């Protein structure tokens, strides 16, 4: 956003400064260096904008847009779960030799230096302690919601 | 008989097909080996039976079938009802 | 015939400022206007509207007026602005279903085939979704009249756009309870979801006001369904649905002692690089 | 007229209840399977048929009396295992 | 380092477990096979 | 040798025949990471044990 | 891994320790029969040429060897016997050589046991080894050992077996591993941090 | 403020052990205690750290050692946490109220109070409380039915100290009877030695009663007039009765054949699809979410 407005070519001959600044509001946004390779400030100027927002439409946006129906109410393709909780953990294991592997030669060149040479392949440590958070929020959510259905349902 | 029977015996059916016993297990043997027709019979006391695999994980996956048939359900009366009041104390 | 429908923002708040222009009058008015957008692919989308000048007065209230010089125009204006934007149908304001609302339907048939209407709210208080649409349908039929017509509800949500997700997530700044992890689902659904479920019980029961006391017609097709509740009813606690239960119980909680078990021992590496940078570095900067 | 505990009725009580012989019952049920009317399973050595789904009937203003009070505690279940939601993860998300 | 203030005063697992077992039972179970063909 | 299964019977000679595909894939795949992260904090004293 | 390290024999040359290629055929073929069963030991230490005529110079693995394999269950103990004492005699096998034989026993019984359900405690005498009582209290401690799936009658003389599935025994040696790990880090992480 | 209770309760702790060999050489023991309770009085309402602590390990040290109350009293004492304890008078101090709960038979809330008093300990050789609380530590556990291999640590200072006693946890794990009593001939006159003889003596219960878990799971339906001649019990008409308390504990759950004599069992098996392995989880998943 920002918009503009004119300002007379007629003042710029004058040498004279417009606007006549009598308040600590307008030099509060500062203009992008690409705007002002263009005519400001030599023709227009900004204007500083806010927006006017109210309950009468706040709320009824809000409480609409993602709204989750009956989905949390769901088992997520039974046989499928646990069969996607080894579609994970086989290779964890081997994710695990990889974190059985770059601790083991650590007590060497100096870790900012295991910083610069990692940007090659693929560390465990970041990508270990990814799929502990993928395997239990897949894990806890489903076995929660199926222990709220036998007492809801009879 | 595989599509709407459990458990039926040996003598049963082999009267409903009007042949031997050794007549009857002749006509299930090379239909499962073609494996067009699943069966466990049986020749020591006759029990046979249709459709009978261990099921694991098919409870609850079916369990889980009929809790979504049912909460499509209970949906589908929910918005019916408040429209049928609307025709008869509308104005 | 019709999957459902998508509504998107923009039509949403292009009610609410009309409801607002029209707030003046005081006594009475419902907002009523022609909804526009296209559908494709089976599902009905929403994009544009207006509000068409409307009366009613309360003695003989069959006397409705849409001034369609109004409608001609201005949906001459829109498809010349937009070609790929048509007319898909109308709505009103909606609180409680007003009876001119069987035959505004029929009045403006004549522009789109599945003319369907859009019930909005104007003061916003549930706990679901306050949008709702109907259908048209008509039955020469069981018992009422020889002459049957009926609006039968289709399902109804807020549908999103990439262009518009910049300016409603821009317009909120109030409370967005993203970061979806373990609890996401928590709230969305298992607090609210078993919530949701209430206000489905609780349905039935404002039908269920008629045991011998409510309105004249009784049931005939309505318990079909209700019998058929209490039958697919889900499987009582005796069969192996005990013993299965604690299979997975003993199979999907292996899995959470094995990922617990880790999270143990990198948090662990982690606090041995906390000490290289602590005994490491006291001697040498002091 | 049998609840859903079991409704799990015999061949001989289908043979007191419409005085047909053992040789033809079953005959009677695969025709009730093949048009629809009913839907369940048939055993034959135990003598048994696990019926599950059944066509629904008409019924007068006392049969909804049964289905107002069988609906009216599962009102208040949903009400208790709830209770537990709000109250035990009530510091998870105010 | 290395004080405990004093108030008061594999190779070798697997074979421990053995021991338990055979502790005093059949040791050099070696001939009593040649003397049980005979009696059993 | 394993090429069929079941068992066999000396009374009379019957053969109970069964078969499942029991479950290899969950345990023994996540059981061996325990003994590989038993390596991991053995290789915690070859950085903290020795050095702090 | 002792057998898979030792599971080429071929360019496993005539080296200087044991100097004798023959006496390396004697230790890949008495680990062999532990580390794995008989869908491999029937093709891969039974048909292998660079592994029959090596012990062909040999009559007392041969016939030890194959009678496990040929099922001659009586003449199985009597080798046995030979065998662990000149394992102990024997440097390098002397400090587990208790640890053999009763993994050697557990592994006779329990394929003689797993091919019948209703076999009599009275047979084993006459065709597997002597001594109804011997084969009584040797039965009694290793089921109770938590190995060997079958269940001893008492009173009408009978053994019968069971199947349990390979989940609870599975189970079983999780539990251990897990309580084994989480033993080493609960106390390494009060050492460091003082 | 001046630390004067703070640097001096360690310097009154410090000249208390020797004020304590002293009097456990030639003098008496208890007037002491009441001096000790002026001086444990007057802790805890002026300062509070370290004076807290120091005072109850050096009460307990004849208490438990002789018959006096003290055992309830620690019970109702308020002053169990001094929340801090310089890891050092921390980590007896768990073991000496230990062994208070072994002695009046509280067994399994001992054995975690005795472990933690194992693992809070320093680095050093000459430990002859540790010889202690390493031969304490599974009496307990003995009195439960669990047994480590208690060996895992053997030093040439702790051979010596465990092989009397490492020969005793051989007998438990074995179900003969006067095997026991063939230590406790044997190696009777050490055990008075290290003060740990009633303990040891009511263990003929526990050896009985994983007899009777042996041979329940080895045997499926034996004579009831067979189970006493293996257990050299030397009557059959009590060998019903250890089985009635078997079944009244709850060891094994099948039935007796009294009139035959012989003794059925069922066989037990897919404990899998039962609750009990998810609380080894839920034991298991919260600790490892605490550390």
Known sequence: ?154 | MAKYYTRITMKRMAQLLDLSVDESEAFLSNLVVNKTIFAKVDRLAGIINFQRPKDPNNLLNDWSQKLNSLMSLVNKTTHLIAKEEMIHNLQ | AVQKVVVHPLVLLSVVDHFNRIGKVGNQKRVVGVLLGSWQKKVLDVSNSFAVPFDEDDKDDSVWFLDHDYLENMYGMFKKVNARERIVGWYHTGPKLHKNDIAINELMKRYCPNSVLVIIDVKPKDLGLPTEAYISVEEVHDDGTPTSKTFEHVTSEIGAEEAEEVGVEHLLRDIKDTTVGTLSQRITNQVHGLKGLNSKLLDIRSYLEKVATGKLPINHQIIYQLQDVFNLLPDVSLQEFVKAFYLKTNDQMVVVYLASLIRSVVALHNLINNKIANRDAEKKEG | ?94 | ?40 | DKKFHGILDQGEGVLIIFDEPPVDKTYEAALETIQNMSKVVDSLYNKAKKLT | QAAELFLDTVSTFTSYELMDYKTFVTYTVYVSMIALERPDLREKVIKGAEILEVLHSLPAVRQYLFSLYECRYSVFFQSLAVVEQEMKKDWLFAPHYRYYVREMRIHAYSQLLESYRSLTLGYMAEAFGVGVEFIDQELSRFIAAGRLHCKIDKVNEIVETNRPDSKNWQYQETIKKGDLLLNRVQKLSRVINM | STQNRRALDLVAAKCYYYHARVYEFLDKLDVVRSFLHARLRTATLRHDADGQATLLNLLLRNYLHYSLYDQAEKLVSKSVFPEQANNNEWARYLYYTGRIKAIQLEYSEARRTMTNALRKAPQHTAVGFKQTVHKLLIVVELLLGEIPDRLQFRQPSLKRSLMPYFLLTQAVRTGNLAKFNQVLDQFGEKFQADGTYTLIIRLRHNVIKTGVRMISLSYSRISLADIAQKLQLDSPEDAEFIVAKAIRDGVIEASINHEKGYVQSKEMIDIYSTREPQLAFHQRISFCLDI
């Open chain 1, 1 to 154: 956003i920002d918009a503009f407005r004119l300002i007379n070519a007629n003042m710029m001959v004058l040498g004279h400064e417009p606007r006549q600044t009598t308040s600590n509001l307008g030099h509060l946004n500062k203009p992008s260096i690409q705007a002002l390779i263009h005519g400001l400030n030599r023709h227009y100027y900004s204007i500083t904008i806010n927006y006017r927002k109210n309950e009468l439409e706040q709320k009824m946006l809000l409480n609409l847009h993602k709204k989750s129906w009956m989905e949390g109410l769901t088992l997520q393709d039974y046989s499928e779960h646990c069969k996607h909780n080894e579609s994970v953990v086989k290779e964890m294991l081997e994710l695990a030799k990889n974190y059985n592997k770059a601790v083991e030669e650590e007590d060497k060149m100096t870790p900012e230096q295991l910083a610069i040479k990692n940007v090659g392949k693929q560390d465990p440590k970041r990508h270990l302690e990814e799929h502990v958070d993928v395997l239990m929020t897949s894990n806890i959510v489903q076995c929660l919601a199926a222990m709220l259905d036998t007492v809801v349902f009879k």
């Open chain 5, 1 to 40: 380092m290395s004080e405990k203030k004093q108030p008061v005063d594999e190779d070798n697992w697997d074979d421990d477990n053995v021991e338990d077992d055979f502790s005093n039972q059949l040791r050099a179970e070696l001939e009593k096979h040649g003397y049980k063909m005979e009696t059993s």
């Open chain 4, 1 to 94: 007229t049998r609840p859903a505990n079991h409704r799990q009725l015999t061949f001989e009580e289908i043979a007191k209840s419409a005085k047909i012989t053992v040789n033809e019952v079953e005959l009677l049920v695969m025709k009730a399977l093949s048009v629809g009317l009913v839907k369940g399973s048939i055993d034959e050595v135990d003598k048994r048929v696990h019926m599950t789904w059944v066509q629904p009937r008409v019924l007068d203003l006392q049969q909804i009396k049964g289905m107002k009070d069988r609906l009216e505690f599962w009102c208040t279940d949903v009400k208790s295992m709830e209770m537990l939601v709000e109250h035990q993860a009530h510091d998870i998300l105010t």
